[PDB]
Amino acid sequence: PKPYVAINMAELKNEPKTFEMFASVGPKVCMVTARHPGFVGFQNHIQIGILPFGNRYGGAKMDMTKESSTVRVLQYTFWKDWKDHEEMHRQNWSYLFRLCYSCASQMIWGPWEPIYEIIYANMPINTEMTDFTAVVGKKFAEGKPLDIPVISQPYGKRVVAFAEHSVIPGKEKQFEDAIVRTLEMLKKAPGFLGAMVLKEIGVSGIGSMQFGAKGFHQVLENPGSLEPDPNNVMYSVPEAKNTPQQYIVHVEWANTDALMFGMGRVLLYPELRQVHDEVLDTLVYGPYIRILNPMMEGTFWREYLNE
Amino acid sequence: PKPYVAINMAELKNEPKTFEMFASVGPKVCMVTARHPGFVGFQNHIQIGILPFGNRYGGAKMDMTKESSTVRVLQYTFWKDWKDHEEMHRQNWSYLFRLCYSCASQMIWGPWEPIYEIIYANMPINTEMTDFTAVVGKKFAEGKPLDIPVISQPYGKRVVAFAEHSVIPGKEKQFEDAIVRTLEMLKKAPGFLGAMVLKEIGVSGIGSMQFGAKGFHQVLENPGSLEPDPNNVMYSVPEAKNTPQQYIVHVEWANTDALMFGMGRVLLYPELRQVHDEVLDTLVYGPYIRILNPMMEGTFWREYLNE
Amino acid sequence: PKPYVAINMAELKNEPKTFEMFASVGPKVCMVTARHPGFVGFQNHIQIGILPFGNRYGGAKMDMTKESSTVRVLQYTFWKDWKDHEEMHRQNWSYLFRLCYSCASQMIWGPWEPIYEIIYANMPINTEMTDFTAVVGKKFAEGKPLDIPVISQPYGKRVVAFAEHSVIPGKEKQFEDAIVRTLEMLKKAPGFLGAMVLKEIGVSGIGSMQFGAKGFHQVLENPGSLEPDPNNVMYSVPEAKNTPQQYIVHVEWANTDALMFGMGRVLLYPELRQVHDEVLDTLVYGPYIRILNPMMEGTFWREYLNE
Amino acid sequence: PKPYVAINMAELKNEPKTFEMFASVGPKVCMVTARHPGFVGFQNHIQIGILPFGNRYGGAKMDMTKESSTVRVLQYTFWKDWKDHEEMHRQNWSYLFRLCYSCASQMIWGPWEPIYEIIYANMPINTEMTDFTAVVGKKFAEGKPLDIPVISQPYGKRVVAFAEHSVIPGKEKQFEDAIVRTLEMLKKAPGFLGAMVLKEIGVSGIGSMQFGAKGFHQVLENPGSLEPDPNNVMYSVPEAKNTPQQYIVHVEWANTDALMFGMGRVLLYPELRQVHDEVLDTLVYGPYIRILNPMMEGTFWREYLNE
Ligand SMILES: [Fe+3]
Ligand SMILES: [Fe+3]
Ligand SMILES: [Fe+3]
Ligand SMILES: [Fe+3]
C-alpha cells in the first residue's frame, strides 16, 4: 500500500567532518527508527546540485558538489501511518535527540521535517545489476513478464529530480490531475526509473526541533545528554500544513543526462508540453528542481509500496 | 506613515562577477523603481552570516562571507500602497525584466518576492557620524531633545538581525502582542538601532517571475531582450499569502557583537526572557536569524516612515 | 512515419566559451523549436573526428577533439512536413534570431541548413542500459520478441558515422538501390545501432541566414536585438537543391572501433564489397565520413519514426 | 551434495613480497591439493576490511587495505568428506610442507585450519557477465526459468561478509533454526549473491602445523626442505572442536554498499529484525563481520554443491 513519507531536511557544512558523522551517526538513527513496527523503510539523499533550466538558474549546475560550501540532506522515512512517525520519535526520544543533537557542530539550517501523503506512485523495487537475471526468470516463471521492472540500482547508483511546487488555492485538483497525466507520459523517456507525487499534510514539530519556550531553552542550553520535553511541542502535524498547498514531484533517473533531457521531455515534446502546461498554470511557486543522490536507503520501502 | 515592504530574495554565486553585476545593474533597477510616485525608498542587504545560537547551528557563524560559495540578497523596497509595487513592475516591465534577467548567469535560486505590512516600527532616520552635531542643534532649537535619535549609519556601516518566524494558526494575536512587548524592552540594549515587525500579506508573482505556462516558457526561452507577458501572472498578491502566517522581526545593531549579545538579552535577562517566552510558545518555525549587511539603500524611506 | 530532417551545420572555435554557449543557448533554441506542432524531435551532434580510411586521410583520426582548433556541429531537427520547419522559423523569428545570433562571437562558418527527405530508415528507439529488462518483458508479453531492439544509448553514449555522398546525374536510382542493399547487409556487423539515408531536397535560406541585400545588411549591422526581415529570403527550399544530388548515409555504432570495422565490413567482406562497389560507381564526391557524437537529443523522434 | 570446508587462516605482512608469493606459491599449493579425488574446489579470500556496525568498531572500515600493516587470508578448500582433506595433506606432505613453509618470511600468525560442515547453503554457480545470455537460453530451453541464478562474478568481482559467531552451550538448535530463517528472508536484499552457514567440526592439526614436541622442533629447525613427521600430530580433527560452538555465516554481495545495507536489513526491516533477534539471544561471541575479497577460486565447487 502507499506509505506516508516524512522528509527530514537540513543544511550542513560541506566538509569531511560532516560526512564522517553521516557515517557514524546516520546508521544509528536509522536503527532507532526501525524500532517502530510502522516503519517500512527509508531513502536518504544528499543534494548534489540544481537543474539550471537552460540559464534560468545560470549560476547552478547539476553537480555543484566540488564548489559548494554546504550540503543539503533530505532524509525520507516511510510509515504505514503518519502517526507512527510521531509515536516513534516520542517513544525513542532519549536515543534520537542525543544522536541528532550530535550533528550540531556541522549544522547551518534545520532540521525541518514536513510530512507527506503519496497521491501517485509508479516506483519499482530496486535491483543491482547482478539481480536482473533471476528477476526475469521468476517473472517469466510466474507468467508475469509485464511485471519485470527497469533496473533501478540502489545505494547512490542513480539520481533523483526533486521538483518543488506550491499551488494556487483552489487549483489543487487541476494540479493533481495534470501532474499524473504528465508523469504517465513521462515514463516513456529513456532512463526513467519511476515517479511519485508527495502532497504535504503537515510538519512534525518534534522532528523539526520546534518546541514551545520550555523546549527551545532546553535545546539551546543542552550539553548533549539531556532531552528537551518532547511534550512541549505546541502544534499537531496538520496544524502546520502550508497553504498554498505544497507538493514534491519526485522522479528517478539512470543518470544526470537522462534526468536533464527526460525531465526536459515535458518542454520539448509538443504533445507532452501541452499537458504539462496545465500543471504550470496552477503554480504559486516552482518548479524548482534539486538534483539528489539517494546514497543510503532501506530498499524494502518499495516492497511495502508494491504489495 | 507606515509603508508596505516588498522583499526580493535570491541566492547567487559568491564570486566577483556577481558583485560586479550588483554594481552595474543594481543602480539601474533602483532608478527604474523610482519612476513610480508610490516608491518611498529601499534598503538592499546581503546576508553575511547566520546567528549560531550557541552551537544550535554549530556550522554557522555571524560572518561566513569568506567561506560561503553563495550570496543571498534581500532587497527591500518600500511603497505607500502595496499595489504601487505591482503597478510599478507592470508599467516598467520592459526595462525591469531585461535588467533583472541580466543576473541570470549568476543565479542559483529566486527571485522570490513576498510583500509585507509593517505592524510595528521603531526605526530612526539614518545619519552619518558627521551629521550628529547639526541634528542635536536642530532638535534642541525646536525644543525636542527627546527626538534626538541614536546614530544609525547608512551604507554598510551597521548590521541587521533578520529573524524569521511562522506562527501557529490562531496564535497570531498572541505573537504580535508579545513580540511588540519584547521589542519595546529590547530597545534598552547597547547599540540598538531600531526594530520593525513585518507581517506577510502575499507574494508578487511578477516580482518572483512566477507566471502561468505561457510566461514560464517565455522566461526559459528568453534571449534577454523579449518580455514575458506580464498579464500571464495567474495569482493576486493575497492569494499567495502563507498559512502558517509568516513574520520577519527586523532589528538593527551597531555591530555584530552588539547584535549577538543584544538579541541575546531576550535569553539572558530574566525579566525579558519571561516576556519573550510568550513569543516562543506561538511558533511553528523559528526563530532563524540571518545576519545582514544593508549595503545599498535609499535612506529617505525612514523619512516617510517618521512623518 | 518518416519525418523530414533539417540539419543545421556550423563551425565554431573549439574553446570552453563555445561549449558554455551550447549549454545556455542550445536548450533555449530547442524549446522554441518545440513550439510548433509539426516538430517531432531532434538529434544534435558535435563532430569528434574523421574516418581516415587507412591513410587516405592520414592527417585525420576518429577523435581529433584534443588537437582541433574548431568544432563542427550538425543539429538535426525532425519535422512531420518540411514546410513545418520553415513555418516554425518564421513564426518564432524574434526569439530564434536573437538566440542564434548570440553564438556570433564563436562562429567561423555557417550556419548552413539543408533539408532532407528520409528514403530509407532502420533506426531503433533509444534506451538506457537500465531500460532493457522492461523492454524485453513488454515485447515478450505482447508476443513480439522480434521487436526487441539493440540497446542504442542516448546522450553521447554511442557514435555516428556521417557519410557524405554526391551522385552523378542519372545514377540516383542506382545509388539508392545499392545503398539500401548495402545497409540491409551492414546491419549484421557487431555494434550496429541503426542506419538511415537522407536525400537533400533543398536548403532553408532563413535557417542559413541567407537573405537578399536588405536582410544581409540587417544581419551584419545587428546589435543582437533586432530581427532581419524574415520575408527577405529570396529563394524557396527546393530552389536551392543541389545537383549533383547529395545524400547523407547516417549509421550509428556502439563505439568507434565498432564503427571503424563495421563500416569497414563493406570493404573487407567480399560479398558485401561487391554490393557496395555498385554504390561507389555512382559517385561524384565521397564517401567522406565524419565521426559524430550525438550529445543532446529529443529521443522521441524515433517514436514518431517507428509508429 | 554439501561438501565439507577446511578454512586455512593466516596473517601476513601487507607488502608486495607477500602478494608476489601468493602468485608463485598459491597456484602450486592448489595444484597439489587437486591431486586428491575428494577435492571439489576452493575459494581463497583476502580480508579487505571489517564491518564497523555504525561506530561500534569506529576504527574500522570496510576497506582498510591502504592503511593496514597486515593481510589476513582465509583459504577455503571443499571436500567430499572432511577425511579427504586429512588424507590429502598426508599423502602430499613433502610437496605441501615445502611449499607452505616458503611463506615463512612473511608470516605473523597462523596457519590455523578449522574444518566445517555446511548446515545450510543457498549458493549459486558463478558466472561472468559474458555468460548470462547462454545461461538464460539454456534454462528456458529446459523449461526451468526458476533455475536462472543471479550473476555472481568470480575472481575478485564481488565481496563476502564473513560473520563469526559462537553460541551458548545448549542454544545451538535455536541458533541454527533462527539463522536459517534469517538467511531465507535476507535473500530479498538487492545484490544478494548467496549464503551458507558453516558449523565447526574440528581443527586440522596438520594443516595448522600443530604437532607434538618432535614436529614442533622440526618446524622451528627447518631449512625448508625437510618434512616434519606428519604422524606427530597428537589430536584428531574432532578432538579440537570448540565449545562454545563456533559458526561462520558466509554471505556474498554484489559490492560493499550492497553488503553494508543488505546485512543491515536484519537491523533496519522490523519483520527481519524480530527474527534475527532470536539469533542474537544465543551468542557468546559476535557477530563480528570481516569483509573478504574472493580473489582466487575454483568455481566448480558450486557445481558439486548444486548437483
Ligand atoms: Fe522524523
Ligand atoms: Fe519588486
Ligand atoms: Fe532550422
Ligand atoms: Fe588444508
DSSP A267-288: HHSHHHHHHHHHHHTTEEEEEE
Q: Please, are residues C233 and C210 in contact by the beta-carbon 8 Å criterion?
A: yes
- In this structure, are residues D103 and D22 in contact, taking their beta carbons and an 8 Å threshold? no
**Rounded to whole angstroms, how far apart are CA atoms A240 and C60?**
66
Q: Which of D266, D239, D255, D118 is nearest to D191 (CA)?
A: D255
Look at residues D234, D243, D10, D258 and name the one whose alpha carbon lies nearest to residue D112. Answer: D10
Contacts of C98 in chain B (CB under 8 A): 223-226
Of A13, A141, A35, which Cα lies nearest the Cα of A93? A35
Distances (CA, A) of A184 to A160, A259, A274, A275, C297: 17, 16, 14, 11, 21
* Contact predicate A223/A200, CB 8 Å: no
Ligand number with the minimum distance to the CA of B84: 2
Instruction: Give the CA diameter of chain A.
Output: 62
Nearest ligand to residue D205 Cα: 4
What are the φ and ψ backbone dihedral angles of C293, each rounded to 5 degrees? -110, 115
Q: Which helix (H) or strand (E) holds A209?
A: none
For this experimental structure, what is the resolution in angstroms?
Answer: 1.8
**For chains A and D, what is the number of CB pairs under 8 angstroms?**
100
Backbone angles phi and psi of B229, in degrees to 5: -70, 110
B201 is written with which cell numbers? 500579506
Say which of A56, A213, A284 has its CB closest to residue B220. A56
Rounded to whole angstroms, the Cα distance separating C56 from C64 reads 16
The length of chain C is 307
- Which of D150, D190, D191 minimises the CB distance to A133? D150
Single out the residue of C114, C28, C9 nearest to residue C71, CA to CA.
Answer: C9
Please tell me what DSSP assigns to residue C255: S
Q: Is B16 exposed, middle or buried (0-12, 13-18, 19+ CB in 10 A)?
A: exposed
Positive or negative torsion for Cα B142, B146, B152, B154: negative
Q: Are D10 and D45 in contact (CB under 8 A)?
A: no
Q: In chain D, what residues touch A134 (CB-CB under 8 Å)?
A: 148-150
User: Hey, is the C-beta of C300 within 8 angstroms of any chain A C-beta?
Assistant: yes
Other C-beta atoms lying within 10 Å of the C-beta of residue B129: 9
Least CA distance to B225: which residue of chain C? C225
- Distance from C-alpha of A191 to C-alpha of C134, rounded to nearest angstrom: 11
Minimal Cβ distance to B223: which of C27, C35, C99: C99
Are residues A67 and B67, on separate chains, in Cβ contact within 8 Å?
no
Residues having C-beta closer than 5 Å to ion ligand 4: D 6, 207
Q: How far apart are CA C110 and CA C129, in angstroms?
A: 36
Inter-chain residue contact D190 with A126, CB threshold 8 Å: yes
Geometric angle at alpha carbon A268, from A264 and A274, rounded to 5°: 105
**Backbone phi and psi for residue D162, each to the nearest 5 degrees, phi listed first:** -110, 100
Contacts of A74 (CB under 8 A, 6+ apart): A7, A8, A9, A44, A45, A47, A162, A290, A292
Contact (CB<8Å) C102/B225: no
Query: Chain C contacts of B224, Cβ < 8 Å?
Result: 98
Nine-digit cell string for D211: 604437532
Residues of D in contact with A41 (CB under 8 A): 268-269
- CB-based contact, B226 to chain C, within 8 Å: yes
Beta carbons of B222 and C31 less than 8 Å apart: no
What stretch of H or E contains D165? Answer: strand D159-167
Q: How far is the CA of A134 from the centre of ligand 1 (A)?
A: 35
Q: Do chains A and B touch (3 or more CB pairs under 8 A)?
A: yes
Q: Which of A67, A235, A243 faces B243 most closely, judged by CB atoms?
A: A243
Give start and end residues of each alpha helix (H) in D81-171.
82-91, 93-101, 132-141
* Joined grid coordinates for residue A144: 508475469
How far, in Å, CA of D270 to CA of D252, rounded? 22
CB B72 within 8 A of CB B22: no
Phi, psi of D206 (to 5 degrees): -65, -40
Q: Which amino acid is at D224?
A: G
Listed by number, the residues of chain B in 96-115 with a beta carbon closer than 8 Å to a beta carbon of chain C are 105
Find, among D150, D111, D163, the residue nearest to D287 by Cα.
D163
Domain housing C40: 1-307
Q: Is C185 helix (H, G, I), strand (E, B) or coil?
A: helix
Q: Give the whole-angstrom CA distance, residue A68 versus residue A108.
A: 14
Residue D190 and residue A300 in contact, taking contact as beta carbons nearer than 8 Å: no
Closest residue, chain A, to C140 (C-alpha): A145
Cis peptide bond upstream of A111, omega within 30: yes
Phi, psi angle pair for D158, to nearest 5°: -160, 175
**Alpha carbon distances (Å) from D98 to C275, D73, D95, D101, D221:** 67, 19, 5, 5, 13
Across the strands, what pairs with D120? D197
Which of A58, A69, A280 has its CB closest to that of B213? A280
List the single residue in A with minimal CA-CA distance to B214: A277
DSSP string, D191-237: TEEEEEEEEEEEE-TTTTT---HHHHHHHHT--SSS---GGG--S-G
CA–centroid distance, B185 to ligand 1, in Å, is: 37
Radius of gyration for the alpha carbons in chain B, expressed in angstroms and rounded: 20
Alpha carbon separation from C283 to A179, C243, C262 (Å, rounded): 53, 12, 21
Contact (CB, 8 A) for C253 and C158: yes
Q: How many Cα atoms sit within 13 Å of B200 on the Cβ side?
A: 24
C-alpha distances in Å from residue D109, one per residue of D11, D40, D106, D232: 5, 27, 10, 21
Residue of C191, C239, C235, C197 lying closest to C215 (CA atoms) = C235
Using alpha carbons only, give the angle C110, C171, C238 rounded to the nearest 5 degrees. 40
> Cell numbers of B272, please?
525579558
D15 annotated to bind ligand: no
Number of folded domains that form chain C:
1
A 10 A CB-CB count for C172 gives 16
User: Which residue reads 548567469 in cell numbers?
Assistant: B105
Cell of D71: 593481510
Task: Please state whether the peptide bond connecting residue A294 to the residue before it is cis, i.e. omega within 30 degrees of 0.
Answer: no
Ligand 4 centre distance from Cα of residue D173 (Å) = 28
What are chain D's partners, defined as 3 or more CB pairs within 8 angstroms? A
Q: How many Cα atoms occupy the beta-carbon half-sphere of D181 within 13 Å?
A: 15
**Is B217–C31 a contact, with Cβ atoms under 8 angstroms apart?**
yes
Q: CA nearest C169: which of C245, C114, C109?
A: C245
Cβ distance B221 to C98 less than 8 Å, yes or no, reads no
Phi, psi of C100 (to 5 degrees): -60, -40
How far is Cα B21 from Cα B12, in angstroms, rounded to an integer? 11
C89 is in an annotated binding site: yes
Asked if residue C5 lies in contact with residue C37, where contact means CB atoms within 8 angstroms, the answer is: no
Show residues of chain D in contact with A42, CB under 8 Å: 268
| Residue-level length of chain B | 307
Q: Where does chain A have alpha helices with state H?
A: 16-33, 82-91, 93-101, 132-141, 172-186, 213-220, 256-263, 265-268, 270-280, 301-306
Chain C residues with beta carbon closer than 8 angstroms to that of A142: none
Could you tell me how far CA A272 lies from the centroid of its own chain? 25
Grid cell, residue C48, equals 569528434
Helix/strand/coil percentages in chain D, nearest 5: 35, 30, 35
- How far away is chain A from the Cα of B259, in angstroms, using its nearest Cα? 18
Whether the CB-CB separation of B142 and B37 falls below 8 Å is answered with no
Residues 6+ apart with CB under 8 A from C64: C48, C49, C50
Is B271 known to sit in a ligand binding site?
no
Residue A133: which of D55, D149, D267 has the nearest Cβ?
A: D149
Long-range contacts of D127-130 (CB under 8 A, 24+ apart): D127/D151, D127/D152, D127/D153, D127/D154, D128/D153, D128/D154, D129/D153
Closest CA to B276 of A209, A216, A227: A216
* Residue D202 neighbours by CB under 8 Å, 6+ apart: D82, D114, D115, D236, D237, D238, D239, D240, D241
Phi, psi (deg, nearest 5) at residue C222: -70, 130
For B209, residues 6+ apart whose C-beta sits below 8 A from its C-beta are B100, B111, B215, B219, B228
Phi, psi dihedral angles at B212 (to 5 degrees): -70, -170
CA C172 centroid distance within chain:
21
Count of beta carbons in the 10 Å neighbourhood of residue B40: 23
